[PDB]
Design a protein around this ligand. Sequence first.
Ligand SMILES: [Ca+2]
Ligand SMILES: [Ca+2]
Ligand SMILES: [Zn+2]
Ligand SMILES: [Zn+2]
Lengths: 406, 406
Amino acid sequence: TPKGTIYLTFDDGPVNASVEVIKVLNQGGVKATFYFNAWHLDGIGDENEDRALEALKLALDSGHIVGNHSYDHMIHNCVEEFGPTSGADCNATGNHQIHSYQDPVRDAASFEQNLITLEKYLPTIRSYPNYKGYELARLPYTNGWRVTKHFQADGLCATSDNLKPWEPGYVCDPANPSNSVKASIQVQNILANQGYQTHGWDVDWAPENWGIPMPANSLTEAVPFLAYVDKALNSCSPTTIEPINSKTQEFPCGTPLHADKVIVLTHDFLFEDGKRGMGATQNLPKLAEFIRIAKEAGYVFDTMDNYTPRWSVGKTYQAGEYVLYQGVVYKAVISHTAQQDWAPSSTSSLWTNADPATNWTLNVSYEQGDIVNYKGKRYLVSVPHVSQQDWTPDTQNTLFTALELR
Amino acid sequence: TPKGTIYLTFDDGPVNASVEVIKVLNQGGVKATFYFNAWHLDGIGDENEDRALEALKLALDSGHIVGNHSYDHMIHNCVEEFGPTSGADCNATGNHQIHSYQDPVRDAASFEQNLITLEKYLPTIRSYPNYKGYELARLPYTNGWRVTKHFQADGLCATSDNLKPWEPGYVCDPANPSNSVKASIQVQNILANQGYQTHGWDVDWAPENWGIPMPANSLTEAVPFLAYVDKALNSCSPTTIEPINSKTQEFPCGTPLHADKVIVLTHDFLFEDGKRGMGATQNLPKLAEFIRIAKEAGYVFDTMDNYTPRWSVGKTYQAGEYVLYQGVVYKAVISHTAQQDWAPSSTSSLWTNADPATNWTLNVSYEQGDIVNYKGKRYLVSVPHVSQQDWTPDTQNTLFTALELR
Ligand SMILES: [Ca+2]
Ligand SMILES: [Ca+2]
Ligand SMILES: [Zn+2]
Ligand SMILES: [Zn+2]
């Protein structure tokens, strides 16, 4: 039995730096999850990205999981008019974390545009089972979670409306979050209703010092980082992680799906020799060494499509246990032994749909106080029940109470 | 038992004309399927479309099914640079059917852009179960079908590379189709791999004479059109329909899923008082009367989400019968009685996946000669089998033969 499971997740690719990152992973004998921004394929992401397509292809060919990080990392909210120079313009101002989210609909759409661009530059991408761009996502800047109906939480200070977390006079009030945060929360919900899961992170492999000309050089060494991983194991890191804009204040500590697991966040661009330092020369060895010693310590590596364990034939389940089946999350209604022909579904008596969505859905175990959307209207669940085709909110006024607005 | 089932399908909405069309359907006590182009919501589709959003909302609120007809009805292939006036520019040239399809990837993407725009103007649209924009589609100009693994066929002369079907010297060779047709075929396959079904039509409710100033006025009357529907019932109309660019030459006549059914194609814009004639004043009554007398003749009306019959608990199925379950097509492997807990799936022994796709998929009954895509490579099925996770094409060289290219 493993000491635990580590999920290496790389954000902001695909870029030139991604190629060697992938090769190190391959030599290390591990799979990882890449949350990509497709604008690098268009060559407007303001990075060394002429090999972007090559990297995307190598990632998928090597069997790594590809997830959705939005088309432009929300840079359209950093400038006045989004264009080919917007990435450079935002880097000049460094206002990434200010007004990061504004119109949730427009921002959520950025994730769908991502799919179009990916499927434009790599028309065969859907033929890869490890392509999960339409199932797995992660919001820029935001340690936010949409995993199950009862496993979700937001980064309540991920982004700001004025001051950056380090600037003098910065105030973070989780109870009354910024407009930007509120928008990101709505974005989470929109994506969840489109069938997405979203995952945050436990630990962030980043420079120990951003106050030097080559901060990438200060990336935590392998031995030290393993200690940080060890410390994160079963310690509800999302609540204690620093800085404050990386927190998930209301993360459900000790939640079964999170036990014995550590999700590592890092970025491809930290592993290249460039404007952030000698990341390739110095950090690629740190990655290779970490993988080796983590395995020596008894860790195994897995990908985010397995974070929620896939339904497996032969296994016994207890009522209340969660599984992932065909991209949909299910919770066991009664303890039983999973048979080939009795998989979870929208009609099974053995399972109920437990996706982290809010739109009215079939075979969900609804509880008093739950709020669902149905045909453009919001309804409150008044009495607990399992939803079925007959019991639509607009007809069942004993089960549902129509909510008023304004 | 019904004499048959009619599927009223309206293309090219949503526009002002759609509002009264929907009201007539509602008064008639029937549901219908609308294949929409979202560019009308942006106000660049060159129609009276200021009430476009109102119509979209009314269609969904009334319980009608909404399907995908692409964002701009492929008008970007009709002009040099697509813009707000492109719809008007294409109407000036009337080159809709020339070079209608060029880059299949770009064209297929038009269907995904459609979803973005729809979900932009109506952010609550996914809360409607009758919203099927991501499951049901129909290609502009093209009587093409992607229904099941063994139920698919293309409009081999739907579009041209030079001359229009009526112009002197026009040649249609189904055995060697135009470049435009070939592109539309690839588009069909791309959409199918994204989980879409596509449906053509049996009969087309259109003007009897386009050679007058108000052709809409000549729309077939109710009594006559019922006769045409009667004639289409179980007669493989897609092969005999006129004009030639509306044909489905290789349509599988007598195929079980098509028996006792007639899909009617028409357009919202034929029911408005405008540049095509007095469609509202004259044709809305024809629609209302047709619905009434069709019912009197013993027909029932259904929508395209039911064209492939939904899996139903309690019903017995014979091996070889097709069903639709959670948007996926399945074929019965063994005759049995459908139970609540034994629905179709990717692991069921009772059903196999029979979607009209070409990417390698789980639990599909593959036959010798079948060609699948897997991780960017094409493989030929050498020996018949049912696919499973272990038997991926890249490892099973007794089941699959890798194809070479160029
Ligand atoms: Ca999902
Ligand atoms: Ca489907
Ligand atoms: Zn990022
Ligand atoms: Zn059309």
